Amino acid sequence: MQIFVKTLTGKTITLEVEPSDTIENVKAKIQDKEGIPPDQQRLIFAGCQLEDGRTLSDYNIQKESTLHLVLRLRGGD
Amino acid sequence: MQIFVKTLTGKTITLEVEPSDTIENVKAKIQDKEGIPPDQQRLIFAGKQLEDGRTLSDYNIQKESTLHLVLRLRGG
Amino acid sequence: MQIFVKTLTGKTITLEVEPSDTIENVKARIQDKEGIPPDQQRLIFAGKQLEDGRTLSDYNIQKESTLHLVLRLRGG
Amino acid sequence: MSSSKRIAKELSDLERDPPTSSSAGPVGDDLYHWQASIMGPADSPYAGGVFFLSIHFPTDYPFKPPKISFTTKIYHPNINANGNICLDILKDQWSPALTLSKVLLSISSLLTDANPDDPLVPEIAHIYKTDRPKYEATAREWTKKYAV
Amino acid sequence: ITGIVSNVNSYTDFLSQIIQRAILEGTALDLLNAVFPTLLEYCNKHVSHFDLNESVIYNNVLTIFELFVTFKPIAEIFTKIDGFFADYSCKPQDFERKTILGPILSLSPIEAAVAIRNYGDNLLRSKQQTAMIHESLQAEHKVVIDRLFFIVDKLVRGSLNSRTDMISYFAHIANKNHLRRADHPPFKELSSNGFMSNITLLLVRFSQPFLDISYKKIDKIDANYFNNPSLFIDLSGETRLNSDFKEADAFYDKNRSKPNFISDCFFLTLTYLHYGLGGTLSFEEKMGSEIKALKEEIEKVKKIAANHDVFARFITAQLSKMEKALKTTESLRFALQGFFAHRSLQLEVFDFICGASTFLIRVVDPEHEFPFKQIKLFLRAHAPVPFKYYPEFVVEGPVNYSLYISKYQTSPIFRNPRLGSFVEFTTMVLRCPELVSNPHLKGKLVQLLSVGAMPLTDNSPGFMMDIFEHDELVNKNLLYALLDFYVIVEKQFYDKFNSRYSISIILEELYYKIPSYKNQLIWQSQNNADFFVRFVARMLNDLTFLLDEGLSNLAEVHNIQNELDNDKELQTRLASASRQAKSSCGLADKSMKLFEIYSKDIPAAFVTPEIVYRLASMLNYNLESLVGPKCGELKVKDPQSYSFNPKDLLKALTTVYINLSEQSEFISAVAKDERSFNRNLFVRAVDILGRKTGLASPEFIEKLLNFANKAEEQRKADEEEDLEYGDVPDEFLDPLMYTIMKDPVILPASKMNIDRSTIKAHLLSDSTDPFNRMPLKLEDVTPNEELRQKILCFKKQKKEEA
């Protein structure tokens, strides 16, 4: 079962996940294909930020869902 | 105490309860067959909620009363 | 006798084998030297899928030949 | 035909029996943009604070939940800086028989209990599950700052 | 060695006999292993930067390679040179410095040093002066590419082992550079664009023979390539079209097949199109914003005085390093534009894309006879097996190229007769949702379709009209495919509307310029009303709140601007709200224009009872905002930037009314929408249109006023009927609508009375009982004739005094 993740640059990526997999598990897999450490990868679903300690079996279970990536940068003037 | 509860599709389960139980104790009687977390315990009884933290002696549940168990979609 | 096994990433490794050894024994040796579980491993010789229960002599594999190990695409 | 008379009768019912600690009404003569005012529960750090509500009724109110947002800034985990409320009956748990008075009572019940398993603000949610003395103090501090 | 490179034109005859000496002696490989590593050392150490700028040196290097490659006995064993293949732990950026083929393939004019040399001298050159700089280098780059092609092709035909060795060599480069598609890839750890662009061009030129205009050599490429596991292309982590990982693995296990070079090359060239030039174009597109960010950073520092000795020197050096970085960036952006504008190279890439589209359409064909015979026109299970297990780059690459490459007036896409091959593949993707389950790559394909159908500055038809007219497969089903994909884009949600924006342009242009599509529409509404009614409803639903979203976003932008009228996240959200406001304003105008042009010719589809009540409410709600203080008081700076022109939108809004003004149902529905109806609204609109001289005709205003008068007398009759029904019993009221029930039916769950329409609308959203949360269906209801008899009796009793 696979989910969609999208970014502010218009890049669409696919990612196969499991209900028992944690959110940090998804961040780690995205890190490999995106070069972004999980600490900067923030995900938006239904307008509410997710939690690292949670999994993918509580936020509105449904297949072919599409998450959004909000990129917070370590550094700010 | 024989109590009844029904899901969305119409399936119902039968088991025992006690007058001195709690709402989570009825919920503890729910995951023994299906396996749903106690945080998702939703009791729609005549248009008002049944709070999970309270005991059984406050929701006036009689013999063979039919409850309504719907899985939760919390978050947001 | 020694053989050469080539990976999708370009790793070239040697392995002492015998004509009557089972392919699963070869995968066990590959796991011993690299830690890749045998079920995940998938060997290709002469562009043909291999079988665990067969031997090297069954597939006419000469010594110092080239093998193509394809890691079966793991899920997420 | 579909929306006006329902809102009119719901307004008339609250006009007959106003809520004790709450008060709601339309903004001017625009029937589809109301305003509600509530007073915090005594058994809570939100007591003594008055909050106004921003209400936007959709064209299909009798079948879709309203869009209601807070106006006053409140130190609460389920309420963001935009005044949005993380509540259940404002979502797929909506029922056509529910009235706006019941929705305002549910707002007060949420203010009383403050369900933390819905983290609209992660920092306040972490604060509530670790030490009450800072959450309760900050709630009254921001009530004094804003809800006066 | 040094003198050999310096004077290769004199040693070309003396050393040739030395090379031939070892051919007959069988010891050629020793000298091959002795010379080429020495040449690599000379290019790396003795010359700090072996690039295109030193015209003397690489011309001699290419001459040496041409001298060596011609010999047939040498090219067959050329792959045994020490260091020919890279290391297993070799870094992706070290391919071009520790390989025999490395430095020579890196010869490209898009390098940083060449850009600094030929662009950094003057930064504000004119458009005419710009083309000369590019053309001074494009011809030389063509010679370099031709010579590299000549070398590599002779490596191909040298022997059977050489073609496998080179495919392995390219596979190891392709897999190490999968991060080129990333948002911020490690440019210092990945391969340069110049090293990979030449490689991408070489394989495309390799594809020229068996991608001929006869398309008869199309069978040389195996359509059954991905049934067997790939030994060169790493498919691990690569998304398939309409198959997940487990089904793909089992399909590898299912059906358990010899490798061939033609198919090995034809799918490696696509990988290089995607992860190569596909990443290069995304790298160049972000140059327009990084320069803007760096200019602000440099501007901020320039206002600071420098007194502290330790800090003043640091500040002075910070400005100089950023000046050099800005020089390099502005040189690179200008160099890449000229590289991309060279038509002699881009025509070949686009022709290859057309041939690959032909090949893909042949694969989709169940008879596999597409280039000769035309094809005839849940989702994953019914998808074709060969098509479903293919990866997702074979579509993403060409679409990214065509989207990016279309922004130039010098585009190869324009006036290319072979273009229609890609369009048939795009329409095929449009028709059947079984082919791809991904709606996002579909949105990119549709946006590319929107770009292709944009009218030019001279208002002439775009470069796609001829193919939309003169393609027998497209004109059969383009309309239905677009209408079907409009409603599925539904599956916050700040991106489901941009696809609707792209669909709107295509719909309006096709309705304008193509009368055959003007017949297919109307035929769609008259013989397939069920399909088209859903499209009408989907367009109507979003249009209610697009204006609300635009008004909220413009107010947000104004508030953020006044915040800075007194940190950078506020500017970021200003840009984010500006883009969403622009999208809202554009899509609302496109929806209204489509409504106008559709109510112009088929008003009968707009008067159905299932949309007539929604349409009047939506139109009235939109009208009140435009004529009310909300739009007037919102004074947006440069309204043409956001396409926010309520004056221009009001004309279409009123034309929607007058087009439907000849229907009594539409007149009645508007008068029954008390939510947003007022006779003064049209009176205000009269003066608003009068402000814009010549925008609205006097007869146009007269028709609008006649419609307003008819609606006003209709509502006066309605309120006359309303006043004669005063006090009413509570039992004759709908417990959810609080009105008199026309057709009261009994709920089986809660045993309460409800109107048929009320419960029908509720069940249209959820199949649950409003009163006790019990499951409920339309077939579970029970009519209440006894209560309707009393309703009639009470109505007649009230008629006894009226």
**Contact flag B10-E772 (C-beta cutoff 8 Å):** no
B71–chain A nearest CA distance, Å: 11
Residue type at position E474: V
How far apart are the C-alpha atoms of D124 and D139, rounded to whole Å? 10
A34–chain E nearest CA distance, Å: 5
Question: Quick one: closest CA in D to E737, which residue?
Answer: D6
Dihedral, CA of residue E210, residue E211, residue E216 and residue E219, to nearest 10: 70
Q: Give the domain extent around D47.
A: 4-145
- CB-based contacts of E81, cutoff 8 Å, min separation 6: E29, E32, E33, E36, E37, E100
- Which chains, if any, share at least 3 CB pairs under 8 A with chain B? A, D, E
User: Helix H segments across E221-342?
Assistant: 245-253, 261-272, 278-285, 287-301, 309-340
- CB-based contacts of E445, cutoff 8 Å, min separation 6: E395, E399, E426, E429, E430
CATH number at residue D41: 3.10.110.10
What the block records as the tokens of E143 is 């010679």
Domains of chain A by range and CATH?
2-71 (3.10.20.90)
**In a 3-state reduction of DSSP, which class is residue E376?**
coil
Domain segments of chain E as ranges? 2-222+274-279, 288-340, 581-723, 730-799
Residue (of E502, E508, E504) closest to E440 by Cα position? E502
**Looking at the partner chain, which of A1, A12, A35 has a beta carbon nearest the beta carbon of E441?**
A12
User: Helix H segments across E411-514?
Assistant: 420-431, 439-452, 465-469, 474-488, 496-513
How far apart are the C-alpha atoms of E704 and E689, rounded to whole Å? 11
Residue type at position E748: P
| Vertex E376 angle, CA E374 and E377, to 5° | 130
**Are the C-beta atoms of residues E636 and E554 closer than 8 Å to each other?**
yes
C21–chain E nearest CA distance, Å: 22
Q: Which residues of D touch A59 (CB under 8 A)?
A: none
How many other β-carbons are positioned within 10 Å of the β-carbon of residue B2?
A: 10
- For E661-693, b where at least 16 C-beta lie within 10 A, e where not — what string? bebeebbbbbbbbbbbbbeebbebbbebbeeee
**Are the C-beta atoms of residues C3 and C65 closer than 8 Å to each other?**
yes
What the block records as the tokens of E308 is 């502290």
Q: Which residues of E touch B68 (CB under 8 A)?
A: 773
- Which chains, if any, share at least 3 CB pairs under 8 A with chain E? A, B, C, D
How far apart are the C-alpha atoms of C15 and E158, rounded to whole Å? 32
**Are the C-beta atoms of residues C56 and C46 closer than 8 Å to each other?**
no
Structural domain count of chain D: 1
Q: Which residues of C touch E222 (CB under 8 A)?
A: none
Active site residue D19: no
Element (H, E) at D37: strand D30-39
Q: Which residues of B touch A59 (CB under 8 A)?
A: 75
Question: Quick one: closest CA in B to D113, which residue?
Answer: B51
**Are the C-beta atoms of residues A2 and A65 closer than 8 Å to each other?**
no
Write the CA distances from E565 to D94, E39, E560, E562, integer angstroms. 43, 63, 9, 5
A61–chain D nearest CA distance, Å: 14
**Looking at the partner chain, which of A2, A34, A47 has a beta carbon nearest the beta carbon of E492?**
A47
- CB-based contacts of E605, cutoff 8 Å, min separation 6: E525, E529, E532, E533, E536, E598
Write the CA distances from E495 to E182, E255, E454, E550, integer angstroms. 20, 41, 21, 15
| Vertex E554 angle, CA E550 and E555, to 5° | 115
CB contact A54 to E (< 8 Å): no
**Contact flag D5-E737 (C-beta cutoff 8 Å):** yes
Residue (of E78, E60, E74, E67) closest to E2 by Cα position? E60
**Contact flag A11-E244 (C-beta cutoff 8 Å):** no
Characterize the bridge pairing of strands C2-7 and C66-69. Answer: parallel
How far apart are the C-alpha atoms of E5 and D147, rounded to whole Å? 84
Q: Which residues of C touch E245 (CB under 8 A)?
A: 73-76
What the block records as the tokens of D43 is 């058994």
How far apart are the C-alpha atoms of E365 and E352, rounded to whole Å? 20
Question: Quick one: closest CA in D to B72, which residue?
Answer: D93
Beta-bridge partners for D53:
D70
What the block records as the tokens of E609 is 């009872």
How far apart are the C-alpha atoms of E464 and D4, rounded to whole Å? 50
A12–chain E nearest CA distance, Å: 7
Resolution stated for this PDB structure, in Å: 4.1
Strands laid side by side in the B12-15 sheet:
B12-15, B3-6, B66-68
How many other β-carbons are positioned within 10 Å of the β-carbon of residue E212?
A: 11
CB contact E237 to A (< 8 Å): yes
How far apart are the C-alpha atoms of E791 and B47, rounded to whole Å? 30
Instruction: Supply the DSSP symbol for D102.
Output: H
Gaps after residue numbers in chain C (C–N over 2.5 angstroms): none
CB contact D97 to E (< 8 Å): yes
Element (H, E) at D27: strand D22-27
Q: Of D39, D68, D86, D104, which one is the catalytic site residue?
A: D86
Residue (of E393, E381, E368, E382) closest to E241 by Cα position? E393
**In a 3-state reduction of DSSP, which class is residue D38?**
strand
What single string gives the DSSP state of each residue in chain A? -EEEEEETTS-EEEEE--TTSBHHHHHHHHHHHH---TTTEEEEETTEE--TT-BSSSS---SS-EEEEEE--S---
Q: Which residues of B touch A49 (CB under 8 A)?
A: none
Q: What is the CA radius of gyration of chain E?
A: 34
**Looking at the partner chain, which of D95, D97, D117 has a beta carbon nearest the beta carbon of B74?**
D117
**Contact flag B8-E775 (C-beta cutoff 8 Å):** yes
D and A interact (at least 3 Cβ pairs within 8 A): yes
Question: Quick one: closest CA in A to E576, which residue?
Answer: A8
Question: Quick one: closest CA in E to C46, which residue?
Answer: E258
- CB-based contacts of E270, cutoff 8 Å, min separation 6: E356, E393, E394, E397
Burial of E211 (0-12, 13-18, 19+ CB in 10 A): buried
**In a 3-state reduction of DSSP, which class is residue D20?**
coil
Q: How far is CA E763 from the centre of its chain?
A: 37
Q: Which residues of D touch E735 (CB under 8 A)?
A: 97
How far apart are the C-alpha atoms of E8 and E56, rounded to whole Å? 10
HSE of A61 in the Cβ direction (CA atoms, 13 Å)?
12
Write the CA distances from E687 to C33, E457, E589, E632, E700, integer angstroms. 86, 33, 21, 13, 13
Helix axes E646-659, E698-723, angle to 10 degrees: 60
CA E616, E619, E622, E626 torsion-angle sign: negative
- CB-based contacts of C62, cutoff 8 Å, min separation 6: none
Instruction: Supply the DSSP symbol for E224.
Output: T
CB contact D92 to B (< 8 Å): yes
**Contact flag A48-D120 (C-beta cutoff 8 Å):** yes
Phi, psi of E783 (to 5 degrees): -60, 145
| Vertex E767 angle, CA E763 and E768, to 5° | 110
**Contact flag B68-E775 (C-beta cutoff 8 Å):** no
**Are the C-beta atoms of residues E156 and E60 closer than 8 Å to each other?**
no
Q: How far is CA E583 from the centre of its chain?
A: 15
Strands laid side by side in the D22-27 sheet:
D22-27, D30-39, D50-56, D67-70
How many other β-carbons are positioned within 10 Å of the β-carbon of residue A52?
A: 11
Residue type at position A15: L
- CB-based contacts of C7, cutoff 8 Å, min separation 6: C13, C68, C69, C71
Interface C–E counts its CB contacts (< 8 A) at: 42
| Phi-psi sector, E240: left (phi>0), alpha (psi -120 to 50), beta | beta
How far apart are the C-alpha atoms of E517 and E514, rounded to whole Å? 5
How many other β-carbons are positioned within 10 Å of the β-carbon of residue E256?
A: 10
Instruction: Supply the DSSP symbol for E212.
Output: -
| Residue ranges of E 86-105 with Cβ closer than 8 A to chain C | 88
- CB-based contacts of E706, cutoff 8 Å, min separation 6: E661
Q: Which residues of E touch B46 (CB under 8 A)?
A: 772
Q: Which residues of A touch C76 (CB under 8 A)?
A: 15-18, 21, 29
What the block records as the tokens of E21 is 């000496």
**Are the C-beta atoms of residues B67 and B4 closer than 8 Å to each other?**
yes
D120–chain E nearest CA distance, Å: 15
B17–chain E nearest CA distance, Å: 24
Interface test with D, best of E737, E771, E773 (most D CBs within 10 A): E737
How many other β-carbons are positioned within 10 Å of the β-carbon of residue D92?
A: 11
**Does E730-799 carry CATH code 1.10.3430.10?**
no
C and D interact (at least 3 Cβ pairs within 8 A): no
Element (H, E) at E762: helix E756-763
What the block records as the tokens of C17 is 């084998």
Determination technique used: cryo-EM
**Contact flag E88-C12 (C-beta cutoff 8 Å):** yes
What the block records as the tokens of E332 is 């690179």
- CB-based contacts of E629, cutoff 8 Å, min separation 6: none
Q: What is the CA radius of gyration of chain B?
A: 12
**Are the C-beta atoms of residues E520 and E502 closer than 8 Å to each other?**
no
**Contact flag D86-A51 (C-beta cutoff 8 Å):** no
Element (H, E) at E105: helix E102-105
Q: Which residues of B touch A58 (CB under 8 A)?
A: 74-75
What the block records as the tokens of B48 is 């008002």
How far apart are the C-alpha atoms of E508 and E593, rounded to whole Å? 8
What the block records as the tokens of E628 is 């009310």
Phi, psi of E91 (to 5 degrees): -75, 145
Q: Which residues of E touch A4 (CB under 8 A)?
A: 438, 440
CB contact E9 to B (< 8 Å): no
**Looking at the partner chain, which of A4, A16, A76 has a beta carbon nearest the beta carbon of E244?**
A16
Characterize the bridge pairing of strands B66-68 and B3-6. Answer: parallel
Element (H, E) at C45: strand C43-45
**Looking at the partner chain, which of D59, D63, D96 has a beta carbon nearest the beta carbon of E617?**
D59
C22-30 long-range contacts (CB < 8 A, ≥24 apart) are: C22/C52, C22/C53, C22/C54, C22/C55, C23/C50, C23/C51, C23/C52, C23/C53, C23/C54, C23/C55, C23/C56, C24/C52, C24/C53, C26/C56, C27/C52, C30/C5, C30/C69
Instruction: Supply the DSSP symbol for D64.
Output: S
Residue (of E278, E275, E276, E291) closest to E334 by Cα position? E291
Interface D–E counts its CB contacts (< 8 A) at: 37
User: Helix H segments across E514-634?
Assistant: 515-527, 529-564, 568-601, 612-627, 629-633
**Contact flag E492-A2 (C-beta cutoff 8 Å):** no
Residue (of B4, B1, B31) closest to B17 by Cα position? B1
What single string gives the DSSP state of each residue in E467-478? HHHS-TTHHHHH
**Contact flag B74-D92 (C-beta cutoff 8 Å):** no
E498–chain A nearest CA distance, Å: 12
| Residue ranges of B 7-46 with Cβ closer than 8 A to chain E | 8-10, 44, 46
**Are the C-beta atoms of residues E100 and E32 closer than 8 Å to each other?**
no
How far apart are the C-alpha atoms of E627 and E686, rounded to whole Å? 10
Residue type at position E418: R
